[model samples]
Target chain A: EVETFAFQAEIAQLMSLIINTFYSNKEIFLRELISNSSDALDKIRYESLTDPSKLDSGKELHINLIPNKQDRTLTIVDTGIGMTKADLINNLGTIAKSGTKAFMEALQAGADISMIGQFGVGFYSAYLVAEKVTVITKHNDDEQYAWESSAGGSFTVRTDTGEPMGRGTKVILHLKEDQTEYLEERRIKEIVKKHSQFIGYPITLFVE
Target chain B: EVETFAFQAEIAQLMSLIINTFYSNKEIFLRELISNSSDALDKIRYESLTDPSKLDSGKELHINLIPNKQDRTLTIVDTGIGMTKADLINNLGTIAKSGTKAFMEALQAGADISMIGQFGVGFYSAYLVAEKVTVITKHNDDEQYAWESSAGGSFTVRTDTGEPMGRGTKVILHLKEDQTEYLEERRIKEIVKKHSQFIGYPITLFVE
Candidate 1:
C-alpha cells in the first residue's frame, strides 16, 4: 500500500533542468547527494546536543556508496538523522519550499548547523543519471518509509519493512541505460574524492 | 508617482544569504550583474531576429560602468532589452518565479536564445555591498521607469522623466559605508576584466 503525491510545479521544472540542461555536469549528482548526506549527519549531531535520545541507533555517522553493475543500480546510504514521512513528502516533493534554506537561516541565527546543501534543489539532480530513484529513510520518531519516483509528475510513498534502516536514509538510483558508469567502484571513488574530499564525515565505497 | 512593492519571501531570503552568508565572495556581485546584462543583450539581439524593430535604438550594443566616489555610488549601464514595469516587479521582486529559467527552457525547445542568469537570485547580490539600488530602464514597447529599493522588504517604481534613455537599463548602486571600495575606478575595472573579459560585447568604464 502506497500513497501517490504529485510533484510541485517548481520541482517538475527543476527536474526538466537537471535532466536536459545539466546533463553535461552529470558528475555533480553524486556530489550533491554526498553533500545532502553530510547535512543530515550534521543535523543529527547538532540535535543530539539537546536530545541525546535522537541517536538511539548508536550507529557511527558515515556515508556509504554501493554500486551493482549487474542490476544497473547505485545506492548511497547514510547513518544520519533520517526523514519522517512529512519530510519525505515535503522536502523531496517541493523545490521552492526548501529545508536547506531554513537550515541555513537557522545557522545564521546562531544555531549550530554545518550543512553544505545550499540549494534545496540538489537532491533532484539524481535524475541527471538515474531513470528512477528510491529513498528509504527511518527517522527516530517515525517508522521506516520508502519514497520512489521516476522524475515524472508524481511519486509514491509507503510503509517499508524491508531490511530495517536502523536509522538514517538509503537512496538507491536505478541508473539509466547510458549511465552505467556510476556503477563502477573506481568511478564512484574518484567522484567522491574529487567533490566530497572535505565532507567531514567518512565517505566509504564498498569494494566487493 | 512612485508605486511600492514588497519583495517575495524567496527574494528576501536570498538577499539575506547574499548579504550575510556570501560575504566572503563579495566580488561575485559584479560578476552576477555583468552576466545579467549580457543575458539581456543576448535576448534583445535574439528578439531582433524575428522583429527587426526591436533594434531601432541603433545604439551599439555594450555595457558601461561609472563610479562616483563623492556620491558613493557605482552605475552599470547596458544597451540591452530593458525592463517594463511588470518585468521589474516580476523578475527582480521574485526569486522563484524566474525569467532566466523560462529563457533557458525556450532555448532548450529549439528557440534561438543565449543567456546565463541561471539562478535568478543573482540580482539581489547587489545588496551585498549596496544600501540601496535604483534601476532606470526603457523598453521598446514601454515608457521609461525607475525602480528603487533599500532592501527593506519593499521597493518602489515610478515614471522617470529625468534622463532621456533611448533603450536599455541603468543600475545605480548606492554603496554601503563599508563598501566604498566598489566606487574606485581601478577596482571596478579589475572586476570587469576578471569576470567579464570574454563577454561578447564591449564594456566601457568612464574614467572621468
Candidate 2:
C-alpha cells in the first residue's frame, strides 16, 4: 500500500507552466534537479556549522550518481536536509499554489531572481526527462520515506522499507525512451560542467 | 473619469504569486518591462521585412525613455504593434488564466523560449515599481487607447483623448517614492548596461 496524492490544482498549473511555457530545453532537466541537490546540501552544511552533531559525526556530505543502463535509470543522491512525510507533502506535493505568491512579497519588491530554490518549480523540471520519478529520503528527525510521481497529475508517498539512506535524499529518474541520452557518462559530465558546476559543489560521475 | 478594470481572479493570483513567491529584486521589473518592449519592437521589425506596409512606412521602430526627476515618472514608449480593445483584454487583462497554459502545449515537447510574444506575464512586471501604470497606445488597425491600473484588483482601458501616440504603445510608470532612483540618468545607464544591453535595441536618456 502507498500513501500517494494528486497534485493540487495550482501545482498542476505550475508544472504545466514549466513544461509548456517558460522553458524549452529538455536537457535543462538535469540542471534543475542537480541544482536542487546542491541547494539542499548547502542548507544542511550551514545547519551543521552551529551544531556539529547535526552532521551525525560528519557522514561525508556529497552527491552520488548511479546510472543503471539496464533498467534505464539515473539516481541523484544528496547527503542533505532530507524530507519527512510532511515536508514531502508540502515541498513536493502542493508547492506553487501557495508558497510562490507569498515568497515573492517577502523578498522585497523587484529583486533579482538568481537564488536557486526561490521558485520551487525547478523540481518538476524532472518531468522533462522522466516518465516516472521516485524519491527516497531520510532526515535527521524522521524515519526514511519514499515519494513517487508520474507527473501526470498526481503523486504518492509511503514509508520506505528498503535500506535507509544516511540522512539525505535520493532521486531516481526513469528516463523516457527518447531521453536516454542523459544516461551516458560523457553527456552527464558535459551537463554537470556546463550548467551546474558553478553551484559551489563538487559533482562526481559514476561510470562503473 | 479614467476608464479602469479589475483583474480576473487568476491574474490577481499570478501577480500575488510573482510578488510574494518568485521575485525579490524589484529592479528586474525594468528588465522584464523592457524585454517585453524589445519583443514588441522585434515583432514589428520582422513584420516590416516581409511586407513594408505591415510596419506602415517604417514608423520609426524604437524605444524611448522619458524619465522626469522632478515629476517622479518614467515612461517606456515603443513604436510597435499596439493592441486593440480585445488584444488588451486578452494580452493585458487576465492572460495567465488561459493563454499561458495552452500556448506551451502547442509548442513541441520542449522549445526555446527565445521567440518573442510567446509569453504574456512579462508585461505585468511593470507593476513592481509603479504605484499606478498607464498604457497609452495606437495601432494602424486600432484607434488610440489608454489602459491603466493600480494592480490592487482591476484595470481599465478607454479612448485616448490626451494625445495620439501616432503608432505603438507607451507605458508610464509613476514610481513609488523610494523608487525614484530609476529617474536618475546616470543610474539608469548602469542599470541598462548590466541587465538589458544585450537585447537588440537602443535606449535614450534625457539630455537635460
Candidate 3:
C-alpha cells in the first residue's frame, strides 16, 4: 500500500535545530554518508551469505569521492547494493524509520551505545554542507533511478537515462557558495582518510 | 548551599534494581569502583594544581585492590582526595540526587551518550557483587571516618581512632558466597585491564 503524510508543524524548526545546533562538527557529514554506505555494503554481504548469486553483480564493493571544481560538486560513490525507488523515498525522507529509535531505546535500556550508528536523521546531514544532492542508484531487480533533493521539504525521483554500472549507488553533493573549501583536494582527501580509512571496503578520492 | 532531604521511597529499590539488572557482567563492578577512585584522584590533582602544599603529606595517589580468598572480602584502596564526614554522608548515602537528574536530562537533550561516567551511579554498582561494603576515608583537612552499609537503605558512620594514612580512601567489599571469582588474581587483573586500562593513574591488585 502507498501512502503520503505531512510533516509535523514543528518540522521546519526541528530541521533548523538539527542543521544549526546539533552537529557542531561539519566534517561529520562525510562520516555519516560513509557509514550509510558501509551499512548498504553489510546488507549486501549478509544477503550474499544466504543467496550467493546476489553478490555476483556488485562483488567489488568500494567507496570513492570525486571532487568536481568546475561544477562545484563533491560526489561520493559506493559500489554496494543499490535501492529501489520506494526504498529510496522512504529511507531518505522519513524520520526514525531507519531503526534508530529502537537503537536508542536499547541504549537507554543499558545496551552499549558505542557499537551502534546514528540513525534516521544522519542521512539528512548532507544538508549541512550541500545546497543540492543527487543520488544515482542501480538495483539488480529494478531499472536504475536518480533521486534529487534540495534540503527543503520536497524531493523528486526519476528513471535513470544512463546505463547501470552493475548494482551500485552514487551521491553527488552540489556545494553551497560558502562550502567551497570541501572542493579542495587536500580537505577531501584528509576527510576520507580520517573518517573512512577503517571502512570495511577500500575508499578513494579523485582530485583534479 | 547546604540542603538535607530524605531519599525517595523507591530509591532503595532503584539502587538494587540498577546494581542487579544493569550490571550482569560481574567485571563491571570493579570498573565502577576503579572509576570512582579515578575521580577521587582527579579531584585531588585538580586541587593540587592550585595548592601544591596539599601533596606535602607524603601520600601518593594509588589504587590498591586486595582480594582475600579465605574471608571472601575485596578491599579497594585509593590514596587520593578523601571526603569529610558530611561529604561521606551526602555522596555515599544519597540516591538519585538532583545533580544526577540534571546530568541525565542534559545527556538526553544532547543525544550524546559518550559520557557514561558522569551519571553518578557507578559507586552503587559494587552492590552487584558484594553483600556488604565498608568505606574508610581520611580527609587531608580533617579527621578520619568509616562508613558501612549492607546494600540496604540504612548506613552508619563512626569516627576513626587508628593512625591516619594522612590522606585518601579505602573500600572493603564483603563478597557474597557466589562472588568468590573476584578473589582470583587473574580475574581481578583482567577486569582492571578491560575497564581501567586508560585510567589516569596506575591500579595495582593484591590477591590471596
Candidate 4:
C-alpha cells in the first residue's frame, strides 16, 4: 500500500516564515534534528512495551552523524520507523498536523520564540543553513524512498537506489557557504552537548 | 554651539531590533511619522492657547511626502518646530527619556503593537525599509543641521548647505527595492487614511 499527504496551507506559510527568518542561529539545526531523532526513539519504545510485535523488525534505535568536510555535507541517521511516501509528503513537506492553526495565530499575535517550537515545525530548522536537504528512509512495512528540497517552495520524492537499511531514516544537509561552521566537529559537539546531552538515547558523531 | 548625548545601551539594542524586525509591515512607517507630527502639532497648539510667544512661529501644521520615483526616494517634510542638533540627537537617537524602562518591560512581557507607538521610538519605524535616511532641520531658536545614517550603527551630522525654509523638519528616505511599494501614490494615500485619518494635522503625499 502507498500513501501521500500534502501540507496544510497555513502550515506551509508558517514553515516558510520560520525557515526564512526565525532560525538565524545555524547551530540550533543540529539540536532540532537530534531532538526529532530522540522523539522517534521514544515513540517506538513506548509502543513496543505494550506490543512486543511492534519491535519485530529487529532494527536497533540509535542516532549517528557523519560529516564530510570535502563535500561540506553532514548526515544524521536514525534507526526508527521510516515513513511511507504519503507520510514523507505530510511529515517532511508540510507542518505537522497538530498545533498548526494555533501556531500561526501565535505568530500573528507576536508570541515569544519559545512558543513556536511547540508546533513541531522545528524540523524545518534544517533549512536555516542548508542550501539543499535530502531525507532517505526505509520503513519496516514500506519500500525505501528519498525526499529532497531546497525549501524554497517545492520538494521532490523518488525511490531509493541504494540497498535499503533494514528500517531507519537518514537526513543529509548540503551546507551553504555561511553554514560551513556546522560541518566542523567542534561546533556540532558543542551544539549536541548544549541541547541534547540529556536525551534518553546515546548519540555519536563520525567526522572525516 | 554643539551638544552630544549617549544613548542608553538598551536603546541601541531596541533601535536595531526595530529597524531589523519590528516593522515587517512597511506601511506602518506612515502611521509612525504621522503620529509624531500629530504629537508636535498638539504640543504647539496646547502652548499657543496660553502663551502668545509660541503662537508667533506658525499658523497651521502639516506633513507632506514628496516622492521622486526616478531617484527612488521619499521625503517626509513636516512644518513643526525644527530640532537643533542637540535636540535631533536627543530626540531621534534615544527612546523616550522617562518611560523607556517601563516601555521595554511591556515589550518584553508581550505588550500590544499599538503600545509601542505610545513610546517615542515610533519615528524610527522609517529605518525598517530605508537604506539611507537623512534628516534636515532648524530649531525655532537654533541653527539648522543635517543628520544622516544607514542605521547600521553610527550616524553623522553636518551643517546645512541651505538656510532653513522656516521652523520645521524634513526626513528623506532612500527606499530599498522591497520598500518601493511605499513610493506608490495610492498606497501612501491609503495608509494615511487608514492610520492617520483622525490626526489633527493635515498630511499630504506628492508622488510622481
Best by lDDT: 1
Model 1 TM-score is: 0.49
TM-score of each: 0.49, 0.49, 0.47, 0.46
Q: Which candidate order results from sorting by TM-score in descending order? A: 1, 2, 3, 4
What CAPRI-style quality would you assign to candidate 1? incorrect
| The TM-score obtained for chain B of candidate 2 when compared with the true chain B | 0.82
Candidate 1 wrong stretches, greater than 4 Å? A93-118, B1-208
Q: What is the DockQ of candidate 2?
A: 0.02
Q: Is candidate 1 or candidate 4 better by DockQ?
A: 1
Predicted candidate 4 versus true structure: per-residue lDDT over A40-102, tens digit per residue: 664555455446676776547789999888888899988766666666776652335444564
Q: Distance (Å) between predicted and true CA of B145, model 4?
A: 79
Whole-model lDDT values for every prediction: 0.74, 0.68, 0.68, 0.68
lDDT digits (tens) for residues A1-208 of candidate 3: 2233333333433344445654446776788788778656655654565478997786887788888989999888887778777667654423333234434454456644222333334565677788888889877788788887664555678888876778878889998898888889888778877765445566887868
lDDT of 3 by residue, B1-208 (tens): 2223344444465456545553346667788788778667755765565478887764477788998887789999888888788777765523245324533564456622223234445676677788988888887787888887775566678887766777888888998888888989988888887666555556888745
Supply fnat for every model shown.
0.00, 0.00, 0.00, 0.00
Per-residue error (Å), model 2, residue A50: 1.1
B69-134, model 1: which lDDT tens digit per residue? 888888989999998777787654233333334433544555331122333446777887898999
Candidate 1: global Cα-lDDT?
A: 0.74
Task: Identify the runs in model 2 with alpha carbons over 4 angstroms from their true place.
Answer: A17-24, A93-95, A98-118, B1-208
